[PDB]
């Protein structure tokens, strides 16, 4: 989607995506 | 002449410019440089389809897709997809000719120019090993690396076995030493020396031998962090000197062979492994081929005295007096000095490019600060205000981006905001004010905002040489809290999670607790905050220690009212998950007991059991099957790269045949050869 509603945009306590290792900028 | 034997030169060689030029252009054997050129070209040929993105070019540069791009200069733009495929074809041909030594100068340029164009097209693809590949190609462009083990010498005998100037090896050795030493110095960071940067890494099975004499914390701190820092600080010295070269080679080889398996860093570890013999004698491949049994000594080309070359000058007492240093010799010496000075200065030049300085210094990729900084992103909120009706709206974080690096850099964030302001009119949003609320924790610190959430990034000022005003400072006087945070995290149950938040004075956090996040509580650790429940319009002031329960499916606001930054906790439980797990366990146990004496809930259990069984079988499966699968995946990647490149090259040369033909060709390109 492109837009989020007021509800889903403000749930900070959501499980992060954790797409692969998004921690180190060196990984591919 | 002890110093002469230890260093390869004497102090008198540095007492004048002429003698420095003569030393830096002293004739040298080209065998080691040639073997490194062959290996670097081979690794680049392997890396172009995999990491450079040849196999996903059609996805990255689709010819009608709305996408926010992040070039170093906004004037740099990507070509159409067919021309991008041509650029990658030229880069691949350059890598091929560099590995073969065929048309070496032209092949070097043909790899270098499209490679750096692709590098500068996307700041979010920058890392230290891609930057190193660019640097190595730049260096090798000016070297005589085709004087040995090349087809240029096989088709032209004068280039065969010709000596190279000494600065060819000096520049490459200086580059490798700079990589090692600057990485070590960048690891002299409080986060690295205290074992925060890579603390999960010790639990890899590759570190099992160290656990026979060390505890988990001890092998994490002493082996991963102090060991890595010592290896980085000492690798160049160990490799340079002859006395320590065997030990240095063994340690560096172990380091890179472990890194190739611990991380996904492309072909960096293999490039460094191939760069290690550059510190050995330039004649080492000749010794290696001369040490083989005599039975395989009649098919290889004969090893004779190398012929003199024009690229380097000869200084003898009997063979004439000498010759004046030519322009090429002075140019090579000056390039060596200036390039090594620039390579030393650039990782510490961030005091000039202040606009690229966030929490960390500069754009990532050219400072050799590998694995020093680990980032955990908790939440991103992008809010726009319609410039016509004043309506507030929210975007999905990263709608038109192919990367997540905009979350950490003000320059990339400014580019992203400009792209969004350009693209949102197509989605019925007039000239928007766009605000960003990005929460990041760096190296297990408190989660905090990296940018000012009240600043309109569309109109916000950004300059390359000015420190960005809307970047929030890293709360450095809260790092000692990390031990307490880790204690709290480890002192929790198996179904509860904790988020640690530090918020600046005058700011507030608007939070919608999910309906399934029952049993959600906030506890104040430092400063003072006011928690507002939006539905009930009630404010309750928190002090240091008190915990408040929060409703689920409802909004709440946390205001930081203290003059100093406040820190608080979020403890929450997936209560729907608790109910699901308890009912699933009860159902399974009752069914098992009844039998021994479908629905989505049982579907989840069946899926988990099947995945566990498959994992156990794959562990019991011999690694030859895993190797075959890995090779099949790589072969698919290479085949798709080749087929899509052929499609685009035919489109460029002859033209597009028809929609049906292109569809069939694309379908054949993604065929998964043997699945
Ligand atoms: C002291 C001047 C620098 C020379 C290196 C000192 C060695 C001490 C610690 C350095 C560890 C490794 C550094 C990287 C290696 C690059 C230099 C190099 O290859 O030198 C060796 C090589 C001899 O080669 P072989 O006889 O094979 O020696 C094998 C050893 N048995 O000697 C040279 O190339 C002489 C080079 C003269 C210095 C130019 C290169 C260094 C440039 C410094 C960078 C900064 C630019 C100028 C600085 C301005 C102020 C001084
Ligand atoms: C016309 C020709 C047609 C050819 C058709 C061949 C048909 C057979 C099909 C097989 C296809 C396989 C081709 C691909 C080669 C290997 C694949 C490959 O490199 O993959 C990368 C793979 C790991 O990738 P990951 O990132 O784990 O992948 C997962 C993605 N995240 O990396 C590697 O294994 C690198 C392999 C290179 C090793 C070669 C040597 C490296 C240098 C070490 C030299 C040591 C020092 C020697 C001293 C001399 C130095 C001067
Ligand atoms: C030039 C290619 C070098 C390759 C870089 C590889 C690593 C080297 C380390 C440097 C990394 C970054 C430093 C770059 C400094 C110069 C950048 C620059 O001039 O343009 C920046 C900026 C683009 O901004 P974005 O954030 O894309 O726009 C946001 C709004 N949508 O461009 C502009 O504002 C227009 C021109 C800016 C001023 C022109 C520069 C004049 C001063 C000259 C010195 C700068 C270059 C020196 C080169 C140093 C050697 C690498
Ligand atoms: C009978 C019909 C279906 C023909 C289909 C054959 C394809 C499976 C062939 C045609 C083109 C081949 C490719 C042509 C060129 C290369 C380059 C080659 O490049 C290298 O990396 C080798 C040199 C090196 O190791 O550096 C790797 C194999 C590959 C991808 C080949 C893989 C197999 C392909 C896709
Ligand atoms: C995460 C680590 C380094 C980051 C890094 C990487 C990944 C590189 O690719 C580098 C290449 C060149 C220069 C610097 C690089 C760099 O900074 C240390 C990883 C921990 C390491 C694997 C533990 C091993 C430490 C010592 C050497 C082990 C003991 C030796 C036994 C054989 C006794
Ligand atoms: C909400 O969760 C908290 C912790 O996740 C629960 O508090 C625990 O209560 C048990 C008593 O059964 C204690 O033994 C634990 O020490 C408590 N843990 C903490 C961190 O305080 C709390 O009971 C839960 N609330 C409900 C209604 O289930
Ligand atoms: C809860 O406390 C805040 C003070 O932190 C009250 O005032 C708001 O404070 C924020 C932060 O400075 C401002 O942005 C708002 O404009 C203030 N007013 C309002 C109406 O939000 C807030 O009013 C209190 N909530 C209730 C329901 O009394
Ligand atoms: C057609 C064009 C866009 C292809 C790109 C060619 C130009 C822009 C490339 C070719 C070689 C590159 C240089 C190679 C090496 C270095 C040293 C490094 O420490 C900073 C960047 C710098 C100075 C590069 C800047 C960009 C560069 C000059
Ligand atoms: C657990 O809670 C998160 C909210 O943080 C939610 O995204 C997830 O869906 C919940 N688990 C299940 C099984 O729904």
Beta carbons of A24 and B371 less than 8 Å apart: yes
Query: Which of B365, B378, B512 has the CB atom closest to A10's CB atom?
Result: B512
What resolution in angstrom units was achieved for this structure? 2.4
B51 HSE (CA, 13 A, CB side): 23
- Among A13, A14, A19, A22, most B C-beta atoms within 10 A, so best to mutate, is A13
The answer on B554 and B659 residing in a single domain is no
Min Cα separation A28/chain B (Å): 6
Q: Is B448 helix (H, G, I), strand (E, B) or coil?
A: strand
Which protein residue's CA is at the shortest distance from atom 9 of ligand 9?
A: B516
Distance of CA B129 to the CA centre of its chain: 7
What is the CATH number for B510? 2.60.120.10
Q: What's the CA-to-centroid distance between B660 and ligand 4, angstroms? A: 25
Min Cα separation B532/chain A (Å): 15
Does B339 reside within a domain? Answer: yes
The answer on B217 and B337 residing in a single domain is yes
Which amino acids bring their CB within 6 angstroms of ligand 2?
Answer: A 28; B 35-36, 39, 46, 264, 267, 270, 273-274, 277, 631, 634-635, 638
| Closest among A20, A12, A13, A7 to B394, alpha carbons compared | A7
Beta carbons of B370 and A26 less than 8 Å apart: yes
Q: How far apart are alpha carbons B181 and B583 in whole angstroms?
A: 57
Positive or negative, the CA dihedral B209, B214, B215, B220 is: negative
Min Cα separation A19/chain B (Å): 10
Q: What's the CA-to-centroid distance between B522 and ligand 6, angstroms? A: 13
How far, in Å, are B550, B608, B609, B610, B621 from residue B615 at the CA level?
A: 40, 10, 10, 9, 9
Radius of gyration of chain A (CA): 13
The answer on B514 and B424 residing in a single domain is no
Does B322 reside within a domain? Answer: no
Q: How far apart are alpha carbons B525 and B547 in whole angstroms?
A: 10
Which experimental approach was used here? Answer: cryo-EM
The answer on B644 and B557 residing in a single domain is no
Beta strands per DSSP E along B386-528: 392-395, 433-442, 448-449, 496-503, 508-512, 520-526
CB-based contact B400:B422 (threshold 8 Å): no
Range of the domain at B418: 374-474
The answer on B609 and B537 residing in a single domain is no
Among the three residues B443, B474, B505, which one is the final residue of a domain in this structure?
B474
Residues of A in contact with B127 (CB under 8 A): 25-28
Does B500 reside within a domain? Answer: yes
Q: What's the CA-to-centroid distance between B72 and ligand 3, angstroms? A: 6
The answer on B536 and B455 residing in a single domain is no
The answer on B201 and B95 residing in a single domain is yes
Does B298 reside within a domain? Answer: no
A24 HSE (CA, 13 A, CB side): 20
Asked if residue A19 belongs to a known ligand binding site, the reply is yes
For B5, phi and psi rounded to 5 degrees?
Answer: -75, -30
In terms of CA atoms, which chain A residue is nearest residue B522? A13
Does B84 reside within a domain? Answer: yes
Q: How far apart are alpha carbons B440 and B162 in whole angstroms?
A: 56
Does B557 participate in catalysis according to the annotation? no
In terms of CA atoms, which chain B residue is nearest residue A12? B379
Among the three residues B576, B595, B622, which one is the final residue of a domain in this structure?
B576
The answer on B197 and B66 residing in a single domain is yes
Query: Which of A3, A11, A13 has the CB atom closest to B396's CB atom?
Result: A3
| Closest among B655, B650, B39 to B669, alpha carbons compared | B650
Q: How far apart are alpha carbons B248 and B231 in whole angstroms?
A: 9
**10 Å Cβ neighbour count for B253?**
14
B559 lines ligand 7 (CB under 6 A): yes
Among the three residues B474, B502, B525, which one is the final residue of a domain in this structure?
B474
The answer on B180 and B54 residing in a single domain is yes
Residue B442 tokens, joined = 């760096």
How far, in Å, are B92, B628, B630, B633 from residue B636 at the CA level?
A: 18, 12, 10, 5
Q: How far apart are alpha carbons B240 and B252 in whole angstroms?
A: 12
Asked if residue A25 belongs to a known ligand binding site, the reply is yes
B581 lines ligand 9 (CB under 6 A): no
Asked if residue A20 belongs to a known ligand binding site, the reply is yes
Beta carbons of A16 and B376 less than 8 Å apart: yes
Does B597 reside within a domain? Answer: no
In DSSP terms, B558 is beta-bridged to B509, B531
Q: Is B309 helix (H, G, I), strand (E, B) or coil?
A: coil
Strands B566-573 and B496-503: antiparallel
> Looking at the 3D structure of chain B, how many domains does it have?
4
Q: How far apart are alpha carbons B231 and B356 in whole angstroms?
A: 30
The answer on B183 and B43 residing in a single domain is yes
In terms of CA atoms, which chain A residue is nearest residue B51? A28
Query: Which ligand places an atom closest to the C-alpha of B520?
Result: 6
Does B593 reside within a domain? Answer: no
The answer on B407 and B540 residing in a single domain is no
Q: How far apart are alpha carbons B259 and B228 in whole angstroms?
A: 11
| Closest among B307, B312, B303 to B23, alpha carbons compared | B312
Asked if residue A26 belongs to a known ligand binding site, the reply is yes
Residue B178 alpha carbon, nearest atom of ligand 1: 14
In terms of CA atoms, which chain B residue is nearest residue A6? B394
> What do you get for the CA distance between the two ends of chain A, in Å?
26
Place of tokens 């505890």: B215
Query: Which of A11, A16, A20 has the CB atom closest to B514's CB atom?
Result: A11
Does B482 reside within a domain? Answer: no
Q: How far apart are alpha carbons B321 and B489 in whole angstroms?
A: 76
The answer on B501 and B387 residing in a single domain is no
């Amino acid at each position: 989607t492109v837009f989020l509603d007021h509800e889903n945009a403000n749930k900070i306590l959501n499980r992060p995506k954790r797409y692969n290792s998004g921690k180190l900028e060196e990984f591919v | 002449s002890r110093i002469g034997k230890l260093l390869g030169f004497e102090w008198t060689d540095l007492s004048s410019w002429r003698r420095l030029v003569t030393l830096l252009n002293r004739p040298t054997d080209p065998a080691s440089l040639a073997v490194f050129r062959f290996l670097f070209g081979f690794l680049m040929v392997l890396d172009i389809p995999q990491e450079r993105g040849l196999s996903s070019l059609d996805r990255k540069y689709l010819d009608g897709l709305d996408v926010c791009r992040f070039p170093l200069l906004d004037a740099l733009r990507p070509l159409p997809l067919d021309w991008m495929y041509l650029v990658y074809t030229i880069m691949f041909l350059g890598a091929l000719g560099m590995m073969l030594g065929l048309c070496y100068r032209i092949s070097c340029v043909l790899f270098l120019l499209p490679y750096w164009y692709v590098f500068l097209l996307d700041k979010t693809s920058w890392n230290n090993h891609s930057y190193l590949y660019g640097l190595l190609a730049f260096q090798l462009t000016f070297m005589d690396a085709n004087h040995y083990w090349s087809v240029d010498g096989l088709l032209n005998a004068h280039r065969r076995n010709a000596h190279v100037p000494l600065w060819n090896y000096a520049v490459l050795r200086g580059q490798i030493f700079i990589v090692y030493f600057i990485a070590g110095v960048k690891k002299l960071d409080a986060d690295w020396v205290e074992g925060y940067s890579m603390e999960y890494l010790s639990r890899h099975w590759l570190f099992s031998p160290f656990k026979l004499l060390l505890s988990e914390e001890l092998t994490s701190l002493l082996v991963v962090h102090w060991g890595g820092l010592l290896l980085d600080l000492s690798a160049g010295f160990l490799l340079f000197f002859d006395v320590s070269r065997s030990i240095g080679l063994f340690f560096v080889s172990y380091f890179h062979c472990m890194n190739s398996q611990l991380f996904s860093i492309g072909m960096f570890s293999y490039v460094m492994l191939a760069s290690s013999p550059l510190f050995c004698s330039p004649e080492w491949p000749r010794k290696l081929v001369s040490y083989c049994p005599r039975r395989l000594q009649q098919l290889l080309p004969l090893k004779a005295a190398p012929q003199p070359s024009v690229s380097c000058v000869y200084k003898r007492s009997r063979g004439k007096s000498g010759q004046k240093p030519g322009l090429r010799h002075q140019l090579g010496a000056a390039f060596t000095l200036l390039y090594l000075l620039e390579q030393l200065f650039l990782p510490y030049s961030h005091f000039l490019t202040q606009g690229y300085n966030n929490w960390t210094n500069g754009l990532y990729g050219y400072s050799w600060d590998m694995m020093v900084h680990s980032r955990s992103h908790q939440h991103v909120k992008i809010t726009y205000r319609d410039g016509r009706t004043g309506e507030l709206g929210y975007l999905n974080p990263g709608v038109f981006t192919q990367s997540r690096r905009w979350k950490d850099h003000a320059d990339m964030l400014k580019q992203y905001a400009t792209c969004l302001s350009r693209l949102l009119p197509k989605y019925n949003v007039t000239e928007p004010q766009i605000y960003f609320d990005i929460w990041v924790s760096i190296n297990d610190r408190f989660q905090q905002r990296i940018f000012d959430p009240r600043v309109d990034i569309v109109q916000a000022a950004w300059s390359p040489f000015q420190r960005t005003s809307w970047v929030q400072p890293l709360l450095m006087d809260l790092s000692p809290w990390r031990a307490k945070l880790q204690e709290i995290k480890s002192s929790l149950d198996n179904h509860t999670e904790v988020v640690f938040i530090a918020d600046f004075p005058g700011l507030h956090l608007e939070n919608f607790v999910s309906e399934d996040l029952g049993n959600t509580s906030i506890q104040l650790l430092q400063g003072e905050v006011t928690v507002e429940l939006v539905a009930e319009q009630k404010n309750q002031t928190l002090r240091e220690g008190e915990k408040m329960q929060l409703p689920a499916g409802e909004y709440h606001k946390v205001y930081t009212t203290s003059p100093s930054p406040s820190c608080y906790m979020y403890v929450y439980v997936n209560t729907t998950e608790l109910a699901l797990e308890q009912d699933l366990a009860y159902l399974q146990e009752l069914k098992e007991k009844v039998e021994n004496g479908p629905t989505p809930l049982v579907q989840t259990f069946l899926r988990r059991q099947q995945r566990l069984q498959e994992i156990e079988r794959r562990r019991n499966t011999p690694f030859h099957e895993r190797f075959f699968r890995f090779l099949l995946r790589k072969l698919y990647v290479f085949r798709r790269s080749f087929l899509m490149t052929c499609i685009s090259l035919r489109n460029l040369i002859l033209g597009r045949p028809s929609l049906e033909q292109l569809a069939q060709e694309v379908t054949y390109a993604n065929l998964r050869p043997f699945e």
